[PDB]
Assembly symmetry: C7
Homo-oligomer: 291 residues x 7
Amino acid sequence: GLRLELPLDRIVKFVAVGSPLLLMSLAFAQEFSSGSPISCFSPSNFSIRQAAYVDSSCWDSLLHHKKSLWPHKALPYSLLALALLMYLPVLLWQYAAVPALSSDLLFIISELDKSYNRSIRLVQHKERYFEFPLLERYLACKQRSHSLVATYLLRNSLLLIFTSATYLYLGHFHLDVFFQEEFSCSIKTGLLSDETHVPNLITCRLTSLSIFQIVSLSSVAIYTILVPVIIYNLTRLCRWDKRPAFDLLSRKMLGCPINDLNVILLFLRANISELISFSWLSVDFMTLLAG
Amino acid sequence: GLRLELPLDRIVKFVAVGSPLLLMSLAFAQEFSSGSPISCFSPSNFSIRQAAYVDSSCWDSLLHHKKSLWPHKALPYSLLALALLMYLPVLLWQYAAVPALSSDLLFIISELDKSYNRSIRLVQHKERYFEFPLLERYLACKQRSHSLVATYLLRNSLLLIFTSATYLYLGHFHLDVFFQEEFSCSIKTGLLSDETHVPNLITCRLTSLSIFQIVSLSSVAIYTILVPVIIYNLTRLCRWDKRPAFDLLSRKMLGCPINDLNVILLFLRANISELISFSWLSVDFMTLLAG
Amino acid sequence: GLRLELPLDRIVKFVAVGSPLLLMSLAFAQEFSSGSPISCFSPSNFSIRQAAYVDSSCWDSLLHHKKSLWPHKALPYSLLALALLMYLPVLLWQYAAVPALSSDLLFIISELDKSYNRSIRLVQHKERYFEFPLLERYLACKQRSHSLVATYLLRNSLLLIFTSATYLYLGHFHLDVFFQEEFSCSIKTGLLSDETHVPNLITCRLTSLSIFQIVSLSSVAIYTILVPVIIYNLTRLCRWDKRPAFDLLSRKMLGCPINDLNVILLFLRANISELISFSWLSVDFMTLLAG
Amino acid sequence: GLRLELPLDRIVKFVAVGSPLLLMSLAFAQEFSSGSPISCFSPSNFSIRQAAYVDSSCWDSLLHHKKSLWPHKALPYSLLALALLMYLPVLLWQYAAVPALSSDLLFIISELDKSYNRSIRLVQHKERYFEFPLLERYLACKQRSHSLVATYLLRNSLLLIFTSATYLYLGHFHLDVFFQEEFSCSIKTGLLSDETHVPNLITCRLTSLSIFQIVSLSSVAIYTILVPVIIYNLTRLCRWDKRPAFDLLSRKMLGCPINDLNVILLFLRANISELISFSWLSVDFMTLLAG
Amino acid sequence: GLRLELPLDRIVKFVAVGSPLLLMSLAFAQEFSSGSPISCFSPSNFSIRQAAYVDSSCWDSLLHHKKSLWPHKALPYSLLALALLMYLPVLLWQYAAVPALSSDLLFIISELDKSYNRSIRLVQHKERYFEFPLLERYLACKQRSHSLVATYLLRNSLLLIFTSATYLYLGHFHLDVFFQEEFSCSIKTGLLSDETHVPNLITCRLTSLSIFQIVSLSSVAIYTILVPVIIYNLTRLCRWDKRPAFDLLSRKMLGCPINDLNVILLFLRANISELISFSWLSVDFMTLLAG
Amino acid sequence: GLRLELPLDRIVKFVAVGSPLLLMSLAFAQEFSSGSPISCFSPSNFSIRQAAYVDSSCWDSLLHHKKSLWPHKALPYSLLALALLMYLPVLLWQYAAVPALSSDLLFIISELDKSYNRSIRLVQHKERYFEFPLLERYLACKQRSHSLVATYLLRNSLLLIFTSATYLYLGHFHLDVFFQEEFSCSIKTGLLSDETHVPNLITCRLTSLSIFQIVSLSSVAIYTILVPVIIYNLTRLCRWDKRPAFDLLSRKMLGCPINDLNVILLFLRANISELISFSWLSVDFMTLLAG
Amino acid sequence: GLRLELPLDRIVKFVAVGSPLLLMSLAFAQEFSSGSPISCFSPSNFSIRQAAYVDSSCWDSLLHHKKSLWPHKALPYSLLALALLMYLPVLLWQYAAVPALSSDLLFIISELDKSYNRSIRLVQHKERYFEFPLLERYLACKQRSHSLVATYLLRNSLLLIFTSATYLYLGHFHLDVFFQEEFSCSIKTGLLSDETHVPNLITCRLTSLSIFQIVSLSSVAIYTILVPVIIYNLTRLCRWDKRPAFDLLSRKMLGCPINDLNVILLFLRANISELISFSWLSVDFMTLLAG
């Protein structure tokens, strides 16, 4: 029943994955309802099937003559790609960091409990500093590594990079097609030319500009909101974490803070409820700890 | 099986989250049924496709010429945003207050049970005042804090602020479009101008004014009803809570009532059924307590 | 596995909550099927879209000129409100009476079982009257209260009040629109006036008068049926309830019958199967009770 | 795991409740499919909307001029009412007879098992007649009552009464509208009069006469079949039921057969598998019973 | 975990009940899809609604003038009735034979196991013939009865009778309407007569003759296949069943084979896996049985 | 948790049953979508209903005049019949072979384990050849039988026969209608003759030739692939199976290989994981087997 | 609870199987929505049914005259075949390698645990090299085999081969039909010729070119991404795997690396968490291992 993810990262992943899916569903469920996502004012003597042909041709082309409006067609697929892009760092953390850290937390929790139990017999009263050789050798070995701190940094770095990519994509493509609801589509380009019945230019109107605007604005707003929490999570480990065995923990509590020790200390602090935290909530001393 | 939420707050959160979703579903399920949410009286010689083009264009524009009716289009999305705004304080309370308070309740419950068991042997008859040092040191440490009382106040403060925001939004936007069921829409503004067939102004009628009025009135009524219960919950802790170990509880029962002691006392009173409340329901005395 | 609700109240709540929902579903499921809930005999030269505009406008207005038929539009929503109005007393009883009464029943059941077990050793043969001080002090304390009897009365009072409100609403609004299946609707009131093509008055017919009549009659009938059972439940406690420990129960069996003793006695009688009711089904005596 | 209902009554209740629901579903699922349940031969120059108006008006009126065909409209609702009418006696038996009889069966089963166990020690060989005072006093008390036999009779009486009511309703209303598939409907009665375009009389045809005939015939047939089993169940207890402790049972096996003893004897016989029925299947004697 | 039904009867009941339901679903799911199950070649000047009226009238009448085609309309209901007719014998066997036979099998299995255990102590080496008085008295009592063999015969007899009824119905009604896909329907019989516009006779074509033919042929084929297995099951008990305690079984293995002994012997043989069948699979002898 | 089916036969049955169902669903789900499965080029002056009549008549007839195209109509039903034809051998194996073989495997497994346990005490060191009389008598009795080997052969024989039947049906019927997408249908054969308006011959086109071709080709390909695995399974037992107790197994390992011994040996080899296969994976010797 | 698949192969199989199904669903769900997947500009005097006939005929033919566009019709079926082609290697690995390897891992894990337990008693201080004869004989027997390494290589080889086949198919067929949205279809080839009304050539346009392009590009991209991980998995075993009993493991750690030893070593390393890995996470020595 161990908890292997910080509470903030859980809600960050949930929001970042869920929101593009919700926006994509809000766009799929409207164009199926309204029918065609584009209308065209065909001439009066175009019967019925020729009007449908004009509609389909202008929707397929999507090129304003008098310049290109391709983002309208590729909205839900581009939104769906964002879901996979957000889900990739979660998969990386799931399949690259949690197996080692799970064992590293279980072992340290068990031996911390054992050390507390051993110190209990000393409480009811110095062969204590050397009494835990494992807690010094193992912790010195892990402090010199750089194994999974890199993955923890890189997950947030990837999330920030993809957020910046979304910013660039939106601000470079969707901005130039705002407030553009109609365009002059043409079909007299290929073999249909040299045929006098069909007019030269046909006006057509997009029927889903509101969905486009709402999706763009909402996505920009939420992915703006989601940046400070990400940078806070990234910068959380930069400052040194401070709250018998805890004395030995504080003994090697110094130096550059970029190790594997900081992440396991953070996960230990976030999982303090597993071990006996009776004395943790009450922040002489031996008399109080006697009970 | 501990209960970590007051019964009143449960129903308040349930109502405040559920009702905008129900109203939004009552609006989605009608415009899909009736087809277009707006009709237009196109001229007789407009064939079929041109009438649909006029309908779609006037629905997209939604601007009365002879002034703007944008709330009609943005009703379900604005209602959906209210659901997230209501759900945010619940998330804050879930992820910021309940972990510490759960441990603080478990510890106090266990040691209260232990103290009652110890006093039982004294019942069947003064080393009793000093017999519980933890119940004095821990309770004095928590009484000097201000940790989670701020969150408890801020949840209700946020709910009140968002209710006021809903009031302002409704009374500033929806009021000026009541009793307005039809408008003169125009399409001869862009490239469609200088074309004599289409008339200058086309009358159009909204087919969902009843849903608009009903949703607005119902939402105003329910969020009016939900205010006194919120202010009662906020003001509940302002008055000091009054009902061996309970004597020590009453001993430090004084001073300014804004501490972390008041909230844990309220949760203890609301969870009296966990411990032995045999003597609680019967509100000399030692002879009665002997059984 | 305690039973905390009388069997009659269960079926009363089930009927009173379920029936408006069933009637509302019988009205939603028909107007979605038949299409428009109102038809209009537009002139022959009105094309197609103008007829739909006339239909929508007359349905939105719903005002007979040659007086108002608004109950037809607001039938399912008014029926849905009745469901919440019926559900409110159930919520009140669930969140205001059952927690105290559950403990009060558990304690009395356990101590009744203990007293029966103690009297068993006296059966196989006067320090018996004073042998149960708790059963006298606790029962005298509860007999002087007025705590949850008020809630039990007020639940049925609220149900009766809401039934009377439904009576008044139906008999004051739905009665004047019976046998009215068609009306002369007009659209030439606003900007559509001074336009000679549209006629002055257009006949329209309601296509759901049968559903209206059936719903009204059925609701009146069932809420007429549901009144005598409610008044019987309310008047049940007015008469004093009569069927070692039961001798002490009969000892304080007198006085004004409006206490908290009557309701707990009723719940004890309705939950006689929990304790040992071997002698209850066989209604000298010590010889029979020896087995 | 006690069985509290006779096998015949189970299938009777299942058939009587299920069949009207099945017939109602066979009528709902057809008129939604075919569209309108009535067609009308409007004149050729009635455009499109006027034909729909004529259809809806004639369906709402449903009055043959050259006399009333209201059963066609009220078929599924009248069938649905039969489901509740059939379900009411089941509810009465569930909430009025089974709680007392459950305890009365459990007690008699347990003490019968105890008596058999006591007689076992006498088998391996007269203080036996007086050895079971409870089996005589309790059984004499129950034989003088009339408590739940009245409910058992009244359930079948109510079922028979409602079957007779269904017979009367069908044979008094549905018989006069058989072989009537078309009628002359009129709409020129109210304000539509003094208008020369609409003809005086319009022929209309019912499109669901086959469903009407099939439902009527099937319901009559099944509720004819269901009567002899009901009367057999009612008359089952009139004849006295005949198959140490069973000798005492046979000792008071006489007199008028209308008591509470007959019903509990029937339920005991139908639940013979609960106790040790090893000797029941083998229908000197002590030597055989020794094993 | 006893098995109370022969494997062959299980598949027979499954096929006989499932197949009419499958055929009925294959007919419901096609006429809902294709729309109307009958088309009519109305004249050119019949507008739109008059053609629908002609279609509905000819479908309702279904009477060839120049003789009756009623089986086409009543196909799915007649197929549904066959499901209940097939299910009735299963209900009879479930509610009339299995309760007695279950106890009769449990008792004989337990005492057979006991006898085998007793003979085990004699194996490791004549007070054996009289050692099982119950196995002789009980088996002689059951051999003289005729209780449930009649039900076992009557179930298969009813299945055969209903198969013959299906044969007669199909071969007497469906045969005369094969290769008949169109007919001359008339509507000028009632009040529509003396009206010159509608022609005297209108040709109409059935659009579901293929479904009719396929259903008829398939049903005939499968219910032909299902007869030999039924007659084999019926004739199975006519021949005497042959494979310490089994010696006593063979001792009364003679006489007329129509008893209750044959059916319980068949069920014992079909449930040989319940008891110790170690020696059954190996079909001197005492030396082999020693292990 | 015994495994009673070879892994190859599992996938063979899964493929052979699933694939016709998948192909049938790929044909049902297309003709419901496209509407009519056949179109006809009716003349210009045929109104609307006469065109539908022509379509339905030509689809029902399906007879090219200038020869018969009946396989197009009977594709999904003929595909559905193949599912039952494939499922029949699985039912035969389930209800005719597995009950005897299950017991025969359980007994041999248990006694093999017992023999291994007995030989264990001899390992840690000739009364061993005669030490297992059952393993010789029972195995000699089963080797002389021919009971369930016939069923095992006949299942694969039936599968091969039905595959050959499918080959013959496809290659004899579907081959002559390939590359035939249109035909000249006629309706002027019966009473519609001697009527000048309808032309003599009407061209019609099949709209589902692609589905026909794809289904035919895919089915031929997969049932070609499925033949070598079937013949391998059939020929598997023809060669003698070769890998204290296993010495006795090898002792009677000779003669004609068509017995019941081969199938139980195959199932034993396929279920080697049930017993102790510690020495099986390591393929002097007594020293190695000591551990 | 053993893990029998490498984590990388799990995600590879998941992606390779899921993605063609997702792409196929993205193509099925669009052409059902838009209606026909192809439109045609029929002449004005073609009524309604002739236009539908032209549409269906041109969709069935799909042959540009002025060369063949068959990939458009066969997109979802060709995508569905890829799912089975990807699933086949997973089935091969499931039914050909995992049963032997499961036992081979269980045995080695159990005996490794036993050896560690035996060495524990030697830790707390040379009959150790010969102390594990099984770990040498069994491991030498498996090192000389080539049984399941071939299957492990062949699974990835098959995946690479099918990826190359997909590359060839796409680049040889889909490339020549890009940027081709319309074609000149003809119907005047068969019996419809010599008929002057229908024109010689009819222009038609594909309405699903965007789906075609998106599916092709996306599939190419993802199956390009999936190649380096496959080749990494294939090349993983080529390099020798390096990290009392582990000394014996290192003793035969040499030679050509193509054996069955490498795969079981890889699976042991990937399943290190099953056994006691307390000393694994802490990478003199005996003093540290004493705890």
